[PDB]
Each structure stands twice: as structure tokens, then as C-alpha cells.
Amino acid sequence: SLTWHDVIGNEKQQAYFQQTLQFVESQRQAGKVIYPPAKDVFNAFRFTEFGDVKVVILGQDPYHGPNQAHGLCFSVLPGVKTPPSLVNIYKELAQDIPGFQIPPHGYLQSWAQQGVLLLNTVLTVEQGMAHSHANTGWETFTDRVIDALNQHRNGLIFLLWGSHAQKKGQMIDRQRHHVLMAPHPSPLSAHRGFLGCRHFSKTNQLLQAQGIAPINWQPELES
Template identity: 50%
Template sequence: MKSWDEFFTQEEAQPYYQQLMQFLEEEYKTKTIFPPKEDLFTCFKACPYEDVKVVMLGQDPYHEVGQAHGLCFSVRKGVKIPPSLRNMYKELKTDLDIDMPSHGYLIDWAKQGVFMMNAVMSVVEGKAGSHQKKGWETFTDHAIQALNEHESGIVFLLWGNWAQKKAELITNPQHKIITSAHPSPLSASRGFFGSRPFSKTNAYLKEMGRTPIEWKIEE
């Protein structure tokens, strides 16, 4: 695997993907779906395959108006910072003494090689989990397997029980996996706070001879 183009060509030939796209076409026509259609694959566009250094996995896109734009955990400038991301910023302050930004737009991370994908990449407005078991899980598992084949070492951040199940797809010994509780308010105090994922990621990247991530978000 050399590029996301190659990955998409491979997936587009498979019946599950064709069925998923037919399903989505109908959903976008008849319901309010997030992210907007043009933002569906932002995580792939923002972070080329060859540049990926870190993988951050989300479960499901935000399901309220104006939030989801195709990068997990991220919201555009001007949108209220959601609770999970606020907790990530709190941990960033504890971990690397980086002050909390005024916005939640994480494109700076993506541009440096942080691949931010939700396992299920679309959702009906106001209905969390509404596009589960439609084919996305197969697609995103295949993306993780494609990243597992990456020639350079990658750090995988697996937060929460659900994300940690994806560890079985990461078999290449040159990659590193960091696990903890999820940053959601329901679980952050049970092992996300104090886990120092940002400094640990950079320590692993340095070990691999790769440039660390500048985690500070520009205003």
C-alpha cells in the first residue's frame, strides 16, 4: 500500500463498499446526515498515507448541527468545544503545559501526520450510532490494516474499550500502541487523565527517528 488512492481503489471494487455508498446516497437524500457529504473523507484528504505518524480513533461523528467535519474529535472554529475534546485539552495542559486553545479545529494535527478517523464515519442528526453496522466498520478496519502495513513506525492511540479491540489489527512490531480510558466525561477520570498520551506519542516518534508532533493548536 503506497497511497490512500490505492486503498480506495481496492475498497471500491468490493460489494460491501458499493452497498455502503448506495445506502449513504439514499440517506443523504432523505435525512440530515453528518458530516456533510463533501466532508465525509476529510481525514484521508487531510493526512496522506505516506505522512501518517499517529492514528487517533474515534467511534462515531458528532451528531449535532455544525459539529462533525470529517476529523474525529475536531470541530471547526466558532463551534463550542465538545466535552471529550475539552478533556483532551485538559490532559494536554497537564502533560505538556500547553494552554487550552479557544477553538476545537484540529487540522494542525492532521497536517503533521495525525490521522483522525471515526470507526463509523457518518451519523443521522441527533441519533448517535445510527449508521453502525452498515459497512463502515469493515471499511475503517481495512484502513487500520492498510496502516499496519506502513513502512514507517506509527503510534496508535486507542482510547476506551471499544478502540482497544482494534489492537488485534495492529500486528506489525514496528508500530506502538498507547491505550487508556476514553476522554469522554463518563470515563476520563478512570484512566485518561494522567495518562500523558501526547508526550508518550512524541517519545515513541523520536525512538522511531520520526519528527515529533507539535501539539499546540494555532489560534
């Protein structure tokens, strides 16, 4: 029943956090193209409340091209070309989940509505520049996010894809929470151990073992 407000609202008063927001705003004011739009930065928290989190998936940076990032890792809004990482996520789901169909869009917010926290560890990026906002304080913030989930929840499933995400989750209590590892679904590593990981069926097995409803991984468009 605890909310993000309850467990991490205190971050608003932290110097590092205020300095992160001040930096992003100054960059925007200077004419830097920063993604996602300001109104979307915290969408993962909007769409999966703290007490509602069942599954945590980490990304690193928001997508850095136009029309892509909207505040959820890996997702793009309807009408946008499915980026390479999500192409591979979808390929895995098609093999892993009976009856899953690769959708003609990349919008994953229906996963968030079911309790899948779609968290990037860095929450903004300058256009075309990977890792541009890596050392701005966002990693501090998302460290606090992961610590809150680790300490104040039990039985979460963390899907940690790639070395950055796995290092990010190094403090997660692996007895109290269920951590699943695979490489990043980017084409740079998908074919070297992500494809075949079966994380989506495994996640559902673990949820069912707890008496929790499994995720319907088939993404839905707005109605």
C-alpha cells in the same frame, strides 16, 4: 510514498463499500440529517496521506449535533463549542505538554497536517442518534484502513482510547507499531484513567526515538 489511492483505492469496487455509500445517499435524499456533509466524509484521508501518517487516533462515530462533525475525529471547525470529549483531551494536553494552552476553539486539523490521522471508525451518523450508522459497512471500510496501516507501514503510534478503539486495533502488530491505551476522553470515562495517561508526551518521545519530528499539539487556526 504510497498513497491512500494505492493501498485502499480498491475498496471503491467492493460491494459493501458501494452499498454503504448508496445507503448514506438514500438517507440524505429522504431528508435524514446526516453528518458530516458528504464533501467532508473522507477529510481524514485528504489531510493525512497514507505515507504521511505518523500517529493514528481513533474515534467511533462522527459528532451527531449540528455544526460539529467535519470528517476528523474529535475536531470541530472554528467558532463551534468544544465538545466534552475534546474538553478532556485539552485538559490532558495542558497537564502533559509544557506550555500547552487550552485553545478557545476545537479545530484539530493542524494535527492532521503533521501526520495525525484523525480517523472515526464510522464515517457518518444521523443527527442526534449515536451509533445510528454502526452496522452499515463503515466498520468494514475502517477495518481495511487499519489493516493497510498495520501491514504497509512500520513504527506508527496508535492512540487507542476506550474499549471500542482497543478492539478495533486488536490485530495491530504491537512489535512493529507502538500502541498506547487509555479510556475514552468522553466525560463517561475521562476521569477513570484518561486524565493522567500522558499519551501526547509519550507519542512525542516515541517519534523522537525514531528520528521523526514530534507533533506540535497546540492547534492552529487558519491564517
